[PDB]
Amino acid sequence: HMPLVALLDGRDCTVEMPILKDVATVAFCDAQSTQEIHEKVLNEAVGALMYHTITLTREDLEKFKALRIIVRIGSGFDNIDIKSAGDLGIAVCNVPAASVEETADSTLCHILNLYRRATWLHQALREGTRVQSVEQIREVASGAARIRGETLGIIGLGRVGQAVALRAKAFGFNVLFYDPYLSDGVERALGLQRVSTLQDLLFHSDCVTLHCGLNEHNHHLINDFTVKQMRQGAFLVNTARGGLVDEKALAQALKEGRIRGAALDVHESEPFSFSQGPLKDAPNLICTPHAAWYSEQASIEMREEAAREIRRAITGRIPDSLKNCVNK
Amino acid sequence: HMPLVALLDGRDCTVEMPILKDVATVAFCDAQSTQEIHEKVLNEAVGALMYHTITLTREDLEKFKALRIIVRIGSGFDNIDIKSAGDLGIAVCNVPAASVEETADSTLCHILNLYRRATWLHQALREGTRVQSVEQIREVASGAARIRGETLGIIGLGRVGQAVALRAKAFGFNVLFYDPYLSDGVERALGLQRVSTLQDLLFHSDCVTLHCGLNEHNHHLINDFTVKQMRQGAFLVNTARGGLVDEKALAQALKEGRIRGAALDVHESEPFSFSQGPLKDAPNLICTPHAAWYSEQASIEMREEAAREIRRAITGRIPDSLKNCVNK
Ligand SMILES: NC(=O)c1ccc[n+]([C@@H]2O[C@H](COP(=O)([O-])OP(=O)(O)OC[C@H]3O[C@@H](n4cnc5c(N)ncnc54)[C@H](O)[C@@H]3O)[C@@H](O)[C@H]2O)c1
Ligand SMILES: NC(=O)c1ccc[n+]([C@@H]2O[C@H](COP(=O)([O-])OP(=O)(O)OC[C@H]3O[C@@H](n4cnc5c(N)ncnc54)[C@H](O)[C@@H]3O)[C@@H](O)[C@H]2O)c1
Ligand SMILES: O=C(O)C(=O)Cc1ccccc1
Ligand SMILES: O=C(O)C(=O)Cc1ccccc1
Numbered sequence: 001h002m003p004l005v006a007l008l009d010g011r012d013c014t015v016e017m018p019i020l021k022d023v024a025t026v027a028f029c030d031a032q033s034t035q036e037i038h039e040k041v042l043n044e045a046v047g048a049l050m051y052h053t054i055t056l057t058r059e060d061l062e063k064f065k066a067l068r069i070i071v072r073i074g075s076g077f078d079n080i081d082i083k084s085a086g087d088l089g090i091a092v093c094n095v096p097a098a099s100v101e102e103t104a105d106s107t108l109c110h111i112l113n114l115y116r117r118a119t120w121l122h123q124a125l126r127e128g129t130r131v132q133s134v135e136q137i138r139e140v141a142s143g144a145a146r147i148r149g150e151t152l153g154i155i156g157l158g159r160v161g162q163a164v165a166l167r168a169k170a171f172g173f174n175v176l177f178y179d180p181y182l183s184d185g186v187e188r189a190l191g192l193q194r195v196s197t198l199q200d201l202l203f204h205s206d207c208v209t210l211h212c213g214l215n216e217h218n219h220h221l222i223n224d225f226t227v228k229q230m231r232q233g234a235f236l237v238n239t240a241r242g243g244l245v246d247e248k249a250l251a252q253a254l255k256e257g258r259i260r261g262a263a264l265d266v267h268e269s270e271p272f273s274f275s276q277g278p279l280k281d282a283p284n285l286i287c288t289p290h291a292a293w294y295s296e297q298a299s300i301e302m303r304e305e306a307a308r309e310i311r312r313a314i315t316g317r318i319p320d321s322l323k324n325c326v327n328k
Numbered sequence: 329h330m331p332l333v334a335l336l337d338g339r340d341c342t343v344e345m346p347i348l349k350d351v352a353t354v355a356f357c358d359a360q361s362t363q364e365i366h367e368k369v370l371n372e373a374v375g376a377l378m379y380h381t382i383t384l385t386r387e388d389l390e391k392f393k394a395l396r397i398i399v400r401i402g403s404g405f406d407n408i409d410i411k412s413a414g415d416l417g418i419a420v421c422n423v424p425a426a427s428v429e430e431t432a433d434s435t436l437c438h439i440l441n442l443y444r445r446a447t448w449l450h451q452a453l454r455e456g457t458r459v460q461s462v463e464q465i466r467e468v469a470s471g472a473a474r475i476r477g478e479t480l481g482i483i484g485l486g487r488v489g490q491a492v493a494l495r496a497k498a499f500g501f502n503v504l505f506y507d508p509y510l511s512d513g514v515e516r517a518l519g520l521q522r523v524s525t526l527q528d529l530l531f532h533s534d535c536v537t538l539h540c541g542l543n544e545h546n547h548h549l550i551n552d553f554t555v556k557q558m559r560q561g562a563f564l565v566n567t568a569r570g571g572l573v574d575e576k577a578l579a580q581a582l583k584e585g586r587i588r589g590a591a592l593d594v595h596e597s598e599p600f601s602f603s604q605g606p607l608k609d610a611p612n613l614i615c616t617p618h619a620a621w622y623s624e625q626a627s628i629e630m631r632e633e634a635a636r637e638i639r640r641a642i643t644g645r646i647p648d649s650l651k652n653c654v655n656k
């Protein structure tokens with residue numbers, strides 16, 4: 001039978017092929033949307049691999065006539081209506097260990113770039129700035145702050161959040177976290193302080209860093225209201241999902257100095273541009289193009305795991321044989 | 329008597345005044361060199377405070393007719409001929425706890441900026457780059473590498489080096505160090521691996537970071553010869569002293585890709601400019617203007633310690649009353 005497996009928003013299937021060569025016909029669509037996908041794929045695809053760059057609504061999903069499984073090459077699956085997918089008989093899986101430490105390292109890099117102003121100092125030198133005197137050094141590095149004794153607030157203490165917490169302690173951070181879905185006790189296991197409300201987290205944190213999934217109940221978790229609950233001159237870091245932050249409220253905060261700096265690897269509308277959107281003329285901003293996850297080893301790893309999940313689905317029974325189905 | 333105390337390469341003495349108000353006449357010179365200092369100061373100054381931006385040769389020192397003590401506001405004193413100073417009856421002191429953790433944090437920021445390419449990714453976005461696909465993300469973030477299992481080589485395991493080592497372990501770095509002046513055993517105390525030669529360090533290290541003082545025997549420690557001993561595609565970080573590196577050899581290494589990236593907070597000639605010198609057209613480079621040390625708290629702390637050292641000298645006996653004399 002050699003069922004059709006399609007890589008939707010990509011053009012390279014080299015890593016996956018050795019794992020699927022004997023049990024699937026593999027093709028790619030290099031599509032940013034379903035409009036771009038061929039009827040043949042929509043009609044015949046039994047399995048699908050996708051990254052974060054394409055979104056599948058129920059309407060998009062309904063276009064697939066033979067699809068039995070979607071595997072996200074990555075951990076986040078907010079870009080798929082998994083509920084409707086399941087109702088349509090489509091299992092959806094992810095790769096949860098995808099770049100856990102890469103993302104945590106990127107998160108720390110961002111935090112350190114804010115506290116040490118390293119990225120901005122480099123930018124200034126590129127622009128031609130000459131820093132001769134100690135007085136000039138202090139002025140150009142104005143805003144740089146000592147880390148020990150500072151409080152880092154983590155929102156979402158999952159895989160990445162935990163990795164971040166452990167690293168943070170090594171710098172002298174006092175680590176707090178807010179995660180309403182976790183059971184009692186993790187705070188004791190990892191030597192952290194837990195707070196029961198988002199407001200508590202924001203109220204006691206000098207630097208806030210997001211590490212929660214994007215779900216039905218936390219769109220614009222950071223908004224006009226909750227930004228006001230953040231400490232004066234606080235930092236914000238986001239390597240989770242752009243939808244978590246109202247970039248309008250963040251822009252205004254940065255301009256008013258209510259927030260001293262922000263570091264974002266994800267944004268409401270991606271790909272990101274410094275010339276398009278609310279953050280266009282916002283100061284004290286660091287941004288990266290959703291690359292917190294990336295390393296060659298990580299990229300290969302998650303693709304290999306995703307292909308194995310596809311193989312388990314074809315060679316076995318759905319959803320019993322699946323390792324990481326997130327819509328049972 | 330109220331002896332004269334002069335801040336040579338600065339214009340602000342506000343932090344120092346409350347500590348010296350009753351025992352010294354305090355003035356500033358805002359001088360980049362002795363040519364800029366008034367004869368009155370050269371003739372009458374009994375004590376001097378200075379940063380890193382002015383250098384005192386024996387000839388410069390001979391211009392001081394009443395000078396009994398110099399205190400470096402900072403740890404490094406390579407900018408003073410301390411031997412000749414001592415021969416001329418001039419005690420020289422420093423502030424050794426100056427920004428230890430600030431500098432270590434900056435060092436980690438730099439390391440993480442190289443491994444995660446965060447600063448360069450931001451630079452690219454500022455330049456207008458749009459990163460839409462996963463394929464584009466990999467290409468633009470090409471060079472980003474997983475940290476766990478990587479070997480960080482530390483040259484100079486002093487205060488900053490040790491602070492860096494501890495932080496590095498939290499990221500999964502295998503930490504090695506080379507420091508020929510340390511006694512047996514520190515490696516066991518801190519859980520590190522020690523090597524006996526610089527070549528060994530360079531040969532086994534994916535990322536090399538400098539944390540040694542600049543002295544008579546390590547000018548251009550990194551040179552055409554020793555760069556060849558470094559691993560292929562290795563990283564280099566320097567927050568110690570610019571004189572430690574032959575920037576000609578480093579430039580050639582970066583261009584040839586022998587060295588994948590370098591992060592420098594210090595340089596052979598400071599202030600640094602991307603338009604002037606061997607590193608002008610060198611790729612994969614991060615640079616900051618000797619600001620690794622800076623935080624408001626750190627800046628105040630070291631100035632307060634330096635003033636207290638000045639006070640101990642005036643109110644007591646030299647060099648017995650001194651806390652941090654480095655030229656007994
Ligand atoms: N930028 C990148 O390249 C990149 C890479 C990996 C992961 N991510 C993102 O980072 C996020 C975290 O990934 P992970 O692997 O740690 O996921 P995870 O499932 O291990 O952790 C998620 C945690 O967030 C918590 N959470 C969910 N909603 C919350 C809310 N409203 N308030 C507080 N806590 C909440 C959950 O209880 C859970 O513990 C994901 O959303 C993922 O999409 C981004
Ligand atoms: N860029 C900045 O803002 C900044 C801030 C603080 C310190 N620094 C610099 O960083 C360096 C380290 O500072 P520190 O406080 O750790 O000093 P430290 O005296 O505590 O440590 C110096 C260590 O380097 C070792 N060393 C000296 N020469 C060596 C060589 N040839 N090979 C190997 N090891 C050698 C010594 O044995 C010593 O253990 C200093 O040179 C200082 O000037 C820079
Ligand atoms: O963003 C995520 O949820 C990830 O797991 C990282 C990622 C990003 C792009 C492709 C694959 C994985
Ligand atoms: O560079 C050093 O040796 C330091 O200790 C940091 C520093 C830099 C500039 C002013 C004061 C201290």
Ligand SMILES: [Ca+2]
Nearest residue numbers: 145206233234
């Ligand atoms: Ca603050």
Ligand SMILES: [Ca+2]
Nearest residue numbers: 473534561562
């Ligand atoms: Ca390598």
